[PDB]
């Protein structure tokens with residue numbers, strides 16, 4: 001499982017040179033789009049030439065130009081390595097990934113961190129095994145590896161840069177900082193007196209106290225003359241660890257139940273309907289109390305032939321709340337089929353019977369009180385509250401988290417008020433972009449709800465934990481910053 005084919009600091013011209021001199025026909029790489037920030041590019045080599053295929057993402061998915069829509073770049077790349085065609089019909093071959101040697105996106109690489117700033121972090125945040133790599137000041141071009149062991153101590157090892165190859169003063173000589181680190185993780189260094197410098201896990205510098213969210217947002221926003229980009233791209237590199245199987249979704253008899261062909265649900269977290277398939281996953285927050293914990297069901301916008309399966313899941317999971325964060329139509333394109341009856345009306349969706357009891361209209365969202373019951377069974381009725389957010393921009397995210405927070409605050413209070421309420425159903429278009437931003441924002445403030453302003457939160461660690469339960473939760477970096485902005489705003493209104 002690799003993601004080294006993504007080059008975060010390369011230009012289009014630098015990519016053509018890399019592919020023509022250090023690659024062969026079939027070699028490929030991915031990079032951020034420089035002419036159109038927020039987008040990405042897939043540089044592939046063919047018949048001695050290089051092709052640049054664009055990849056756009058406004059918050060819903062990764063749209064490959066002339067290709068398909070994917071939940072993650074790794075999932076996109078894996079899909080084609082096991083037909084991608086130009087818009088002229090020619091077949092593209094993604095054969096040999098061109099590995100990147102830039103360590104910017106590594107969890108343990110901290111750039112120009114100082115030795116004093118490093119020793120401080122390693123002493124107050126680190127445990128046995130915590131390690132990090134920083135740039136050297138007294139020896140420009142070199143790097144410094146600091147490991148903590150323990151009664152406890154911090155050990156500093158120098159990394160020399162000689163002729164574009166790295167070494168720790170002796171032994172083997174590696175082509176990249178990453179190769180050197182992995183080698184000494186599998187084969188840790190040992191001092192003559194017995195001390196083993198075990199590189200267990202990288203020092204955590206993203207966990208913050210909820211109180212200092214504003215000062216942490218200020219830091220991640222500074223100009224080079226941005227930290228958000230470093231924190232985010234370092235998280236995107238970790239997505240190659242989340243390639244769980246999606247067999248049931250790929251089955252022939254389930255293809256037409258997916259809104260997007262390749263955006264499929266994980267097998268180990270998909271909702272099994274007790275004719276068992278639906279593009280949805282259970283999101284159970286896991287972290288390292290007397291109140292029942294809240295779970296979620298991230299799913300896609302209903303298709304005309306999946307509305308019956310949607311209400312079967314809602315009834316089966318005992319869900320009492322539904323969060324819709326998209327219009328039925330956006331930019332003249334269908335994003336979710338109407339799965340609820342007109343106000344005061346009564347419809348039958350297969351064996352399920354739904355009545356739209358009442359609709360309450362605000363500017364940002366509409367609320368519908370639906371009464372769900374199993375046809376032919378009297379003692380099965382229950383109320384289901386559908387919160388339909390309608391003011392989310394077509395592209396990007398809202399400029400202010402105000403409306404979204406008041407929206408989710410009401411959603412939280414309706415759930416808390418219903419005894420034995422099942423998971424909260426949250427859907428969108430593909431159910432990964434906006435649906436991921438809402439669930440992540442809800443999980444993060446629920447932690448603050450129960451522990452207070454003085455508690456520890458880890459935005460990246462939380463997103464990663466949620467991404468292992470549905471492909472590509474939280475799509476873009478704009479939704480990333482918006483998550484920090486939301487947690488920061490919610491804290492300022494207390």
Ligand SMILES: N[C@@H]1c2ccccc2OC12CCN(c1cnc3c(N4CCCc5ncccc54)n[nH]c3n1)CC2
Nearest residue numbers: 104105106107109110111230231234235238460461464
């Ligand atoms: N390499 C970046 C960089 C470049 C230049 C200078 C400094 C600098 O620091 C870096 C490294 C440190 N830091 C982090 C650390 N961890 C993550 C992270 N994960 C992903 C899933 C596993 C995980 N588990 C627990 C916590 C976080 C995470 N996602 N984003 C992150 N960012 C900021 C960015």
